[PDB]
Amino acid sequence: MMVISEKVRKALNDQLNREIYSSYLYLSMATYFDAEGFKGFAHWMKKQAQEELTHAMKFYEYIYERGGRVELEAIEKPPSNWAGIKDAFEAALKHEEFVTQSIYNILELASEEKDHATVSFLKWFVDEQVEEEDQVREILDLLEKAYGQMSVIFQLDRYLGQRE
Amino acid sequence: MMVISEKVRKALNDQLNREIYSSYLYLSMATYFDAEGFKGFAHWMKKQAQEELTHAMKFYEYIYERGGRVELEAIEKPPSNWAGIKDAFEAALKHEEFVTQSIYNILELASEEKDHATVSFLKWFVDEQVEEEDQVREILDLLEKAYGQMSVIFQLDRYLGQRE
Amino acid sequence: MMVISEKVRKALNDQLNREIYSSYLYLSMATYFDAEGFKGFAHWMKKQAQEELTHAMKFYEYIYERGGRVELEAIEKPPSNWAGIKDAFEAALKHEEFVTQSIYNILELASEEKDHATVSFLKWFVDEQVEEEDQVREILDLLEKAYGQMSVIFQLDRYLGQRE
Amino acid sequence: MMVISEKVRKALNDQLNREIYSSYLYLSMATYFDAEGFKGFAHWMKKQAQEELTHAMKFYEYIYERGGRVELEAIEKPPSNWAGIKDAFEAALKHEEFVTQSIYNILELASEEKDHATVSFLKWFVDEQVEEEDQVREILDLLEKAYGQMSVIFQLDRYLGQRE
Ligand SMILES: [Fe+3]
Ligand SMILES: [Fe+3]
Ligand SMILES: [Fe+3]
Ligand SMILES: [Fe+3]
Ligand SMILES: [Fe+3]
Ligand SMILES: [Fe+3]
Ligand SMILES: [Fe+3]
Ligand SMILES: [Fe+3]
Ligand SMILES: [Mg+2]
């Protein structure tokens, strides 16, 4: 029997679908980088793509642990194109910043319902969102010091290309 | 873009400098124990002065992860002298309980601001302060039993001198 | 029983507090570099901050080995910002030149007191200073030849970030 | 052909005979401790007797490396008894302070003769003396805190008997 409220379980099932769209958007950003020929920026986006699926599946399993069930919704067609590589990472950071407020809302909800289990579970994601945002800001700060200079963008592309 | 409010960024930069003073105070307690010939008690204070610096850096790294920047403030001269070994450790405990409260104030503040990243971050330090206080209470407890019997005080000195 | 003069003890104690300020100042230059996005330069300053505490602790242990004791004085608030990478290191070297002069003065003093134990002890620091200055001009030299591109000031940052 | 002065050679030769007396004196303090039943203190003095012969042999080899030769003079009968453990070590340190002054005098002499080879050679002994004195005050310090019980003066004897 479901020991999570339907309201809270909807909030988790939504953020779940939100993390899948997160992976999808990133995969799409890989299509952008691959098209412009930065195979290393593309490699990074694909790796973030599958990291988001591991986020999705943490919500998947917690929902069933508390006796819920997941309904996968439709996935919106994500953007296909950005200005510079700086613009895509700005869209990345904005999306990440939107994802962390999505999670704060689920947190604040469960806090009102005194569902301490969901309140606790959700803290891994509060910490990982600090890392995910910071990952992106560091990249943007280096982009803006490349200042177009492409010997440096090569050094970035080759580098991000080495993420495991 | 700083994603922490300046009010909480100031509280953490304060708590950083406060962790540095802890390090400084403890090394001063080591100057005392060394002047009094207890080189193993002094080893403990030099080891714990080191621990405090790692605490300071945990705030350092966190402030920059949230778009902040650290400004180091002046460090008040700590005391040079205590009554005896019991008095010095009692000063240490009363100082760690003050640190614990000081951390509580930043958590109660971040909570009011719905800044859940900082509330989660400070979990590590509340758990850590539990052990810091207990480390010191444990030691005080065996000095009372010692009641001067420098066969026990000696063997304690010789054993707290193998802290890693 | 103390076998250094009180003039020489004080000079060693002042030097210990100067080495500790140095540690603080270097950590302060890391708070600059981290704010400006050069995690490698920040890594180098942080590693330099640790080194200066091992210099402080070498004046520590020597004072006690001569029957003396260490008083820890207050740490002045250090500068928190500089005009550029070059400018921060120019401040770094101007400081290092000031410590080597400071050490010189307390060498010439122990000489006059025909305290040969302390003259011999300070040889190590006369040697370490020669390196610590030269290490910093090598960096100013590669920075006067870097004159602008992030392509060199990156490969430099990245490599200075490998200081063990 | 001899390249030290005869004033400096004699001073080194007198010092060699003083290091040898030291070896004898320390062996004599072991004959006290062994009579009084403290085989560990006796072990420490015996190991110290060997060490002083390695100091004697360092003035030996240096004299021949400068074209000189060593005359062995007569060894004065040393004291054979003391008022207590504390008192014997107080005599030990009073002696060590006398050798470090003796060495100082022949350093200040080689300086005046601008014999820099011998000034540099004596650095090692200025360093070793700082340790040999400090090692003995550490023992007087643990003996002023031992003030009576064989329970501490045993665990001390036993451990000093582990000197390699
Ligand atoms: Fe995610
Ligand atoms: Fe993410
Ligand atoms: Fe702490
Ligand atoms: Fe602490
Ligand atoms: Fe230094
Ligand atoms: Fe330095
Ligand atoms: Fe000797
Ligand atoms: Fe000796
Ligand atoms: Mg601890």
XYZ file of C-alpha atoms and ligand atoms in Angstrom:
665
model
C 0.000 0.000 0.000
C 1.181 3.494 -0.919
C 2.722 5.153 2.137
C 3.292 8.351 0.125
C 0.493 10.800 -0.512
C -0.795 11.083 -4.046
C 0.240 14.743 -4.155
C 3.842 13.949 -3.198
C 3.909 10.870 -5.404
C 2.817 13.030 -8.329
C 5.601 15.495 -7.527
C 8.190 12.695 -7.649
C 6.747 11.131 -10.778
C 6.912 14.560 -12.409
C 10.501 15.308 -11.449
C 11.238 11.825 -12.763
C 9.860 12.761 -16.191
C 11.737 16.040 -15.769
C 15.058 14.221 -15.309
C 14.420 12.216 -18.478
C 13.759 15.380 -20.421
C 17.031 16.559 -18.877
C 18.896 13.664 -20.436
C 17.083 14.188 -23.740
C 17.938 17.894 -23.955
C 21.583 17.094 -23.284
C 21.660 14.374 -25.931
C 20.196 17.041 -28.230
C 22.979 19.434 -27.275
C 25.368 16.656 -28.310
C 23.734 16.743 -31.741
C 24.558 20.441 -31.823
C 28.202 19.951 -30.844
C 28.658 16.993 -33.174
C 27.216 19.106 -36.020
C 29.637 21.964 -35.358
C 32.430 19.349 -35.027
C 33.390 19.537 -31.327
C 33.465 15.805 -30.687
C 34.702 16.462 -27.144
C 31.908 18.777 -26.161
C 29.596 16.185 -27.696
C 31.236 13.474 -25.594
C 30.576 15.471 -22.439
C 26.917 16.017 -23.292
C 26.365 12.321 -23.950
C 27.920 11.509 -20.592
C 25.724 14.028 -18.834
C 22.892 12.551 -20.854
C 23.256 9.161 -19.223
C 24.014 10.645 -15.804
C 20.527 12.195 -15.951
C 19.031 8.759 -16.619
C 20.663 7.555 -13.399
C 18.941 10.493 -11.709
C 15.613 9.450 -13.213
C 16.059 5.931 -11.922
C 16.733 7.044 -8.345
C 13.226 8.542 -8.346
C 11.947 5.422 -10.066
C 13.144 3.150 -7.288
C 12.203 5.372 -4.341
C 8.636 5.629 -5.662
C 8.266 1.846 -5.706
C 9.980 1.512 -2.310
C 7.229 3.646 -0.763
C 4.621 1.643 -2.679
C 3.830 3.965 -5.571
C 4.145 3.438 -9.278
C 5.638 5.436 -12.131
C 3.824 6.689 -15.221
C 6.076 7.841 -18.027
C 4.677 10.884 -19.798
C 5.430 12.236 -23.243
C 8.761 13.975 -23.827
C 8.812 17.402 -25.444
C 10.976 17.955 -28.490
C 13.997 19.833 -27.122
C 15.836 22.696 -28.844
C 18.165 21.589 -31.643
C 20.424 24.608 -32.055
C 22.220 27.346 -30.080
C 24.394 30.331 -30.941
C 27.935 29.662 -29.711
C 29.089 26.839 -27.522
C 28.742 29.452 -24.797
C 24.999 29.722 -25.425
C 24.360 25.989 -25.097
C 26.128 25.858 -21.737
C 24.113 28.896 -20.634
C 20.961 26.992 -21.566
C 22.447 24.031 -19.705
C 22.990 26.075 -16.522
C 19.533 27.623 -16.778
C 17.978 24.179 -17.142
C 19.986 22.896 -14.189
C 18.906 25.893 -12.122
C 15.279 25.165 -13.057
C 15.716 21.515 -12.091
C 16.963 22.414 -8.619
C 13.928 24.575 -7.894
C 11.713 21.755 -9.132
C 13.355 19.648 -6.414
C 13.130 22.327 -3.707
C 9.379 22.437 -4.338
C 9.021 18.680 -3.860
C 11.081 19.095 -0.682
C 8.969 21.962 0.694
C 5.825 19.978 -0.177
C 6.912 16.865 1.754
C 7.978 19.091 4.620
C 4.407 20.348 4.920
C 3.021 16.799 4.760
C 5.636 15.698 7.330
C 6.718 12.934 4.943
C 10.156 12.824 6.507
C 11.138 9.893 4.289
C 10.826 11.906 1.068
C 12.360 14.926 2.787
C 15.461 12.840 3.547
C 15.735 10.962 0.230
C 15.612 14.296 -1.587
C 18.853 15.524 -0.004
C 21.110 13.521 -2.314
C 19.571 15.596 -5.076
C 20.006 18.879 -3.213
C 23.722 18.135 -2.994
C 24.092 16.775 -6.512
C 22.413 19.915 -7.898
C 25.121 22.035 -6.246
C 27.687 19.929 -8.081
C 25.743 19.942 -11.370
C 25.361 23.735 -11.421
C 29.010 24.214 -10.396
C 30.191 21.826 -13.112
C 28.503 24.113 -15.653
C 29.618 27.466 -14.226
C 33.276 26.417 -14.299
C 32.930 25.546 -17.996
C 31.256 28.904 -18.737
C 33.966 30.837 -16.886
C 36.637 29.160 -19.010
C 34.655 29.751 -22.198
C 34.528 33.468 -21.447
C 38.328 33.488 -20.960
C 38.907 31.590 -24.178
C 37.272 34.782 -25.537
C 36.756 33.122 -28.887
C 40.488 32.238 -29.048
C 40.120 28.739 -30.465
C 43.473 27.291 -29.463
C 41.873 27.447 -26.003
C 38.529 26.080 -27.176
C 40.471 23.141 -28.586
C 42.049 22.631 -25.163
C 38.573 22.655 -23.627
C 37.113 20.341 -26.290
C 39.954 17.843 -25.962
C 39.628 18.061 -22.154
C 35.873 17.639 -21.652
C 36.318 14.899 -24.241
C 38.146 12.889 -21.562
C 35.299 12.643 -19.024
C 34.706 9.021 -17.993
C 26.157 34.973 -10.249
C 26.266 34.363 -6.510
C 23.475 31.860 -5.770
C 23.738 32.368 -2.001
C 22.277 35.472 -0.416
C 24.844 37.911 0.889
C 23.473 37.456 4.411
C 24.317 33.733 4.438
C 27.553 34.202 2.471
C 28.642 36.548 5.278
C 27.651 33.957 7.888
C 29.775 31.297 6.196
C 32.733 33.593 5.642
C 32.423 34.413 9.339
C 32.316 30.742 10.196
C 35.355 30.151 8.000
C 37.468 32.752 9.863
C 36.001 31.264 13.038
C 37.336 27.817 12.111
C 40.762 29.378 11.510
C 40.711 30.942 14.962
C 39.904 27.481 16.317
C 43.026 26.206 14.596
C 45.063 29.094 16.022
C 43.676 28.672 19.530
C 44.498 24.967 19.508
C 48.061 25.558 18.380
C 48.335 28.029 21.235
C 47.132 25.338 23.595
C 49.991 23.316 22.131
C 52.430 26.100 22.973
C 51.150 25.812 26.543
C 51.421 22.023 26.814
C 54.883 22.181 25.316
C 56.066 24.848 27.748
C 54.839 22.533 30.510
C 56.708 19.523 29.090
C 53.689 17.426 27.994
C 54.770 16.761 24.437
C 51.976 14.255 23.766
C 49.190 16.596 24.781
C 50.920 19.109 22.537
C 50.938 16.570 19.709
C 47.161 16.266 20.075
C 46.618 20.019 19.829
C 48.881 20.295 16.787
C 46.973 17.460 15.132
C 43.641 19.108 15.939
C 44.795 22.515 14.785
C 45.351 20.683 11.519
C 41.829 19.283 11.565
C 40.368 22.755 12.010
C 42.114 24.001 8.859
C 40.375 21.251 6.895
C 37.079 22.454 8.359
C 37.855 25.992 7.248
C 38.607 24.694 3.761
C 35.308 22.793 3.643
C 33.646 26.207 3.935
C 36.150 27.759 1.555
C 35.340 25.206 -1.134
C 31.602 25.537 -0.493
C 31.505 29.335 -0.775
C 33.185 29.240 -4.172
C 30.875 26.427 -5.315
C 27.914 28.793 -4.712
C 29.313 31.827 -6.530
C 30.691 33.505 -3.423
C 34.148 34.683 -2.561
C 36.064 34.416 0.693
C 37.636 37.359 2.475
C 40.012 36.554 5.309
C 39.613 38.745 8.395
C 42.118 39.461 11.120
C 42.731 36.791 13.764
C 42.554 37.907 17.383
C 45.445 36.815 19.563
C 44.357 33.691 21.498
C 45.324 33.134 25.133
C 48.768 31.781 25.920
C 48.132 30.214 29.322
C 45.664 28.082 31.258
C 45.616 26.804 34.816
C 46.502 23.205 34.056
C 45.668 20.417 31.635
C 42.070 20.055 32.842
C 41.542 23.817 32.488
C 42.947 23.841 28.961
C 40.665 21.062 27.766
C 37.734 22.729 29.494
C 38.488 25.850 27.487
C 38.527 23.634 24.399
C 35.103 22.140 25.085
C 33.489 25.489 25.870
C 34.961 26.734 22.590
C 33.589 23.812 20.572
C 30.098 24.277 22.006
C 30.360 27.904 20.896
C 31.342 26.706 17.439
C 28.387 24.311 17.496
C 25.961 27.083 18.343
C 27.548 29.329 15.714
C 26.895 26.616 13.107
C 23.325 26.210 14.388
C 22.744 29.921 13.753
C 23.768 29.562 10.101
C 21.500 26.555 9.705
C 18.542 28.336 11.331
C 19.263 31.283 9.001
C 19.600 29.258 5.813
C 16.366 27.495 6.769
C 14.493 30.794 7.023
C 15.811 31.772 3.580
C 14.749 28.410 2.088
C 18.380 27.965 1.015
C 18.296 24.177 1.153
C 21.758 23.703 -0.363
C 23.363 25.403 2.635
C 21.124 23.589 5.129
C 22.198 20.245 3.651
C 25.852 21.244 3.538
C 25.854 22.022 7.270
C 24.746 18.492 8.108
C 28.364 17.371 7.937
C 29.353 19.951 10.525
C 26.553 19.210 12.968
C 27.503 15.531 12.912
C 31.168 16.490 13.132
C 30.605 18.836 16.086
C 28.972 15.956 17.983
C 32.243 14.051 17.724
C 34.400 17.103 18.433
C 32.587 17.769 21.714
C 32.567 14.062 22.598
C 36.309 13.758 21.905
C 36.894 16.480 24.481
C 34.383 15.245 27.060
C 35.935 11.791 26.876
C 39.353 13.265 27.659
C 38.085 15.451 30.500
C 36.391 12.406 31.996
C 39.728 10.588 32.425
C 41.557 13.613 33.794
C 39.024 13.781 36.653
C 39.698 10.136 37.422
C 43.401 10.998 37.192
C 43.091 13.614 39.981
C 46.808 14.280 39.745
C 47.971 10.624 39.742
C 50.703 11.425 37.176
C 51.075 7.715 36.575
C 47.732 8.006 34.771
C 48.363 11.531 33.427
C 51.740 10.367 32.104
C 50.255 7.388 30.331
C 47.507 9.528 28.872
C 50.054 12.059 27.553
C 52.048 9.237 26.058
C 48.877 7.896 24.374
C 47.196 11.028 23.045
C 50.636 11.517 21.484
C 49.803 8.800 18.942
C 46.862 10.609 17.392
C 47.182 10.250 13.616
C 66.075 26.190 31.681
C 66.149 28.672 28.790
C 69.548 28.875 27.036
C 68.701 31.438 24.360
C 68.666 35.086 25.211
C 65.341 36.835 25.510
C 66.341 39.148 22.670
C 66.964 36.106 20.473
C 63.886 34.214 21.689
C 61.670 37.202 20.852
C 63.287 37.482 17.420
C 62.538 33.810 16.760
C 59.006 34.244 18.121
C 58.411 37.283 15.937
C 59.670 35.260 12.994
C 57.308 32.391 13.767
C 54.387 34.828 13.738
C 55.702 36.243 10.450
C 55.791 32.781 8.894
C 52.206 32.308 10.047
C 51.105 35.608 8.524
C 52.817 34.456 5.332
C 50.666 31.363 5.391
C 47.597 33.557 5.750
C 48.679 35.966 3.004
C 49.231 33.100 0.591
C 45.815 31.681 1.423
C 44.471 35.167 0.769
C 46.044 35.206 -2.710
C 44.288 31.892 -3.314
C 40.973 33.545 -2.436
C 41.767 36.055 -5.163
C 42.725 33.425 -7.757
C 39.709 31.277 -6.921
C 37.420 34.283 -7.343
C 39.024 35.015 -10.735
C 38.630 31.415 -11.912
C 42.259 30.169 -11.886
C 41.928 27.058 -9.730
C 45.529 26.084 -10.531
C 47.106 29.288 -9.251
C 44.776 28.930 -6.273
C 46.036 25.374 -5.785
C 49.635 26.634 -5.820
C 48.960 29.311 -3.208
C 47.121 26.829 -0.983
C 50.030 24.396 -1.188
C 52.300 27.328 -0.395
C 50.156 28.157 2.603
C 50.813 24.703 4.026
C 54.538 25.053 3.433
C 54.809 28.265 5.421
C 53.216 26.525 8.406
C 55.980 23.925 8.258
C 58.445 26.843 8.404
C 56.532 28.271 11.368
C 56.677 24.914 13.112
C 60.442 24.752 12.542
C 60.945 27.959 14.530
C 58.485 26.459 17.027
C 60.330 23.254 17.777
C 63.684 24.999 17.890
C 62.509 27.521 20.497
C 61.389 24.725 22.798
C 64.574 22.784 22.154
C 66.424 25.746 23.693
C 64.286 26.014 26.824
C 62.035 28.765 25.444
C 58.342 29.086 24.735
C 56.178 30.479 21.942
C 53.655 33.267 22.340
C 51.180 33.540 19.471
C 50.370 37.142 18.632
C 47.504 38.460 16.525
C 47.402 37.887 12.763
C 46.890 41.082 10.769
C 44.120 41.047 8.195
C 45.869 40.398 4.847
C 45.098 42.012 1.480
C 42.245 40.302 -0.354
C 42.591 41.463 -3.993
C 45.249 42.453 -6.558
C 45.397 44.065 -9.992
C 46.284 40.868 -11.883
C 48.056 37.518 -11.890
C 51.396 39.260 -12.376
C 50.610 41.775 -9.648
C 49.713 39.150 -7.036
C 52.975 37.289 -7.562
C 54.946 40.536 -7.492
C 53.402 41.018 -4.062
C 54.357 37.411 -3.280
C 57.991 38.028 -4.050
C 58.116 41.422 -2.332
C 56.930 39.553 0.762
C 59.462 36.759 0.414
C 62.239 39.328 0.114
C 60.952 40.858 3.342
C 61.107 37.584 5.230
C 64.650 36.865 4.026
C 65.696 40.294 5.275
C 63.894 39.632 8.547
C 65.760 36.340 8.943
C 69.031 38.077 8.070
C 68.524 40.529 10.948
C 68.101 37.758 13.513
C 71.085 35.944 12.069
C 73.249 39.049 12.429
C 71.862 39.366 15.963
C 72.653 35.814 17.068
C 76.103 36.352 15.606
C 76.720 39.399 17.838
C 75.532 37.387 20.841
C 77.951 34.619 19.758
C 74.940 32.292 19.905
C 76.277 29.849 17.332
C 73.491 27.301 17.879
C 70.915 29.747 16.480
C 73.250 30.971 13.730
C 73.640 27.372 12.549
C 69.899 26.747 12.866
C 69.066 29.661 10.563
C 71.246 28.326 7.753
C 68.358 26.155 6.577
C 66.168 29.204 6.166
C 68.845 31.195 4.357
C 68.866 28.294 1.911
C 65.081 27.886 1.718
C 64.610 31.589 1.066
C 66.957 31.475 -1.943
C 64.658 28.855 -3.440
C 61.367 30.462 -2.385
C 62.340 33.729 -4.074
C 63.723 32.070 -7.221
C 60.603 29.922 -7.507
C 58.547 33.090 -7.609
C 60.674 34.925 -10.179
C 60.487 31.893 -12.445
C 56.741 32.432 -12.380
C 56.971 36.177 -12.982
C 59.330 35.372 -15.819
C 56.870 33.001 -17.488
C 54.189 35.639 -16.878
C 56.116 38.466 -18.497
C 56.425 36.114 -21.483
C 52.757 35.118 -21.251
C 51.809 38.825 -21.697
C 48.209 37.942 -22.644
C 46.791 34.733 -24.152
C 44.781 32.509 -21.934
C 46.384 29.802 -24.103
C 49.620 30.195 -22.133
C 48.052 31.342 -18.839
C 45.895 28.213 -18.992
C 48.630 25.653 -19.668
C 50.461 27.468 -16.897
C 47.509 27.391 -14.462
C 46.881 23.718 -15.248
C 50.498 22.775 -14.579
C 50.963 24.891 -11.449
C 47.897 22.997 -10.243
C 50.017 19.845 -10.186
C 52.185 21.061 -7.311
C 52.239 18.196 -4.810
C 101.735 18.532 5.209
C 99.683 19.995 8.068
C 97.262 22.748 6.958
C 95.659 23.539 10.313
C 97.431 25.763 12.752
C 98.998 24.204 15.805
C 96.720 26.301 18.002
C 93.709 24.862 16.175
C 95.101 21.316 16.037
C 95.664 21.348 19.808
C 92.141 22.673 20.357
C 90.735 19.820 18.268
C 92.992 17.336 20.070
C 91.913 18.635 23.462
C 88.322 18.292 22.311
C 88.863 14.702 21.204
C 90.207 13.870 24.665
C 87.195 15.653 26.178
C 84.802 13.558 24.103
C 86.638 10.471 25.331
C 86.369 11.553 28.962
C 82.665 12.091 28.300
C 82.429 8.505 27.166
C 84.107 7.422 30.387
C 81.921 9.645 32.576
C 78.775 8.249 30.999
C 80.017 4.709 31.542
C 80.667 5.742 35.133
C 77.048 6.884 35.542
C 76.038 3.453 34.262
C 78.116 1.865 37.028
C 76.046 3.922 39.448
C 72.694 2.985 37.885
C 73.648 -0.682 37.659
C 74.620 -0.681 41.334
C 71.257 0.911 42.213
C 69.301 -1.636 40.168
C 68.096 0.481 37.204
C 69.359 -1.595 34.284
C 67.463 0.635 31.838
C 69.118 3.883 32.891
C 72.373 1.928 32.846
C 71.571 0.779 29.309
C 70.982 4.397 28.258
C 74.295 5.588 29.691
C 76.163 2.701 28.057
C 74.605 3.518 24.691
C 75.562 7.131 25.331
C 79.105 6.046 26.062
C 79.351 4.517 22.600
C 77.969 7.660 20.999
C 80.609 9.903 22.530
C 83.321 7.691 21.038
C 81.808 8.292 17.608
C 82.110 12.028 18.363
C 85.724 11.491 19.424
C 86.420 9.625 16.205
C 84.915 12.490 14.191
C 87.496 14.914 15.589
C 90.032 12.143 14.937
C 89.422 11.681 11.242
C 89.161 15.405 10.636
C 92.551 16.105 12.234
C 94.228 13.600 9.936
C 92.325 14.918 6.943
C 94.089 18.244 7.570
C 97.605 16.829 7.830
C 97.608 16.669 11.639
C 97.947 13.912 14.195
C 96.251 12.943 17.451
C 97.988 12.656 20.798
C 96.000 10.754 23.418
C 96.376 12.275 26.866
C 95.473 10.729 30.209
C 91.840 10.161 31.197
C 90.959 11.627 34.591
C 89.237 9.317 37.039
C 85.512 10.184 36.790
C 82.995 10.433 39.642
C 81.538 7.063 40.617
C 78.371 7.910 42.607
C 75.586 10.526 42.792
C 72.779 11.498 45.155
C 69.948 10.186 42.955
C 68.612 9.549 39.466
C 67.796 13.240 39.082
C 71.201 14.248 40.413
C 73.158 12.035 38.008
C 71.367 13.468 34.989
C 71.807 17.009 36.291
C 75.513 16.204 36.273
C 75.046 14.794 32.762
C 73.594 18.021 31.475
C 76.066 20.249 33.322
C 78.745 18.285 31.468
C 77.051 18.578 28.094
C 76.767 22.332 28.574
C 80.501 22.362 29.268
C 81.350 20.560 26.053
C 79.160 22.886 23.976
C 80.977 25.848 25.505
C 84.295 24.138 24.831
C 83.328 23.627 21.187
C 82.166 27.244 20.978
C 85.625 28.441 22.053
C 87.383 26.513 19.291
C 84.817 27.720 16.794
C 85.442 31.339 17.778
C 89.163 30.562 17.511
C 89.052 29.067 14.016
C 86.979 32.075 13.023
C 89.716 34.501 14.150
C 92.273 32.445 12.223
C 89.929 32.637 9.197
C 90.193 28.839 9.083
C 86.814 28.317 7.442
C 87.336 24.578 6.893
C 87.321 23.975 10.663
C 84.506 26.469 11.269
C 82.352 24.544 8.789
C 83.407 21.210 10.293
C 82.242 22.239 13.767
C 78.730 23.051 12.570
C 77.772 19.398 12.982
C 78.742 19.503 16.631
C 76.924 22.770 17.280
C 73.868 20.931 15.983
C 74.516 17.676 17.858
C 75.009 19.533 21.125
C 71.596 21.213 20.818
C 70.073 17.742 20.683
C 72.298 16.151 23.337
C 71.351 18.849 25.847
C 67.637 18.819 24.973
C 67.571 15.029 25.211
C 68.827 15.324 28.761
C 66.394 18.032 29.876
C 63.523 15.956 28.532
C 64.654 13.317 31.000
C 65.032 15.757 33.889
C 61.591 17.033 32.997
C 60.015 13.578 33.199
C 61.947 13.083 36.445
C 60.714 16.272 38.069
C 57.230 14.975 37.218
C 58.089 11.470 38.434
C 58.894 12.960 41.894
C 58.668 9.534 43.584
C 56.760 6.402 42.521
C 58.733 3.537 41.178
C 55.595 3.078 39.044
C 56.735 5.954 36.823
C 60.496 5.531 37.364
C 60.055 1.911 36.283
C 58.069 2.495 33.089
C 60.680 5.153 32.423
C 63.658 2.856 33.131
C 62.104 0.093 31.021
C 61.582 2.410 28.057
C 64.945 4.182 28.249
C 66.324 0.644 28.107
C 65.014 0.407 24.548
C 67.481 2.970 23.210
C 69.035 1.360 20.134
Fe 19.530 15.628 -12.617
Fe 21.399 17.417 -13.838
Fe 35.688 22.823 13.551
Fe 36.435 21.573 15.956
Fe 58.882 30.904 4.923
Fe 58.154 31.475 1.804
Fe 79.838 14.719 22.412
Fe 77.265 14.376 24.371
Mg 37.073 14.738 14.513
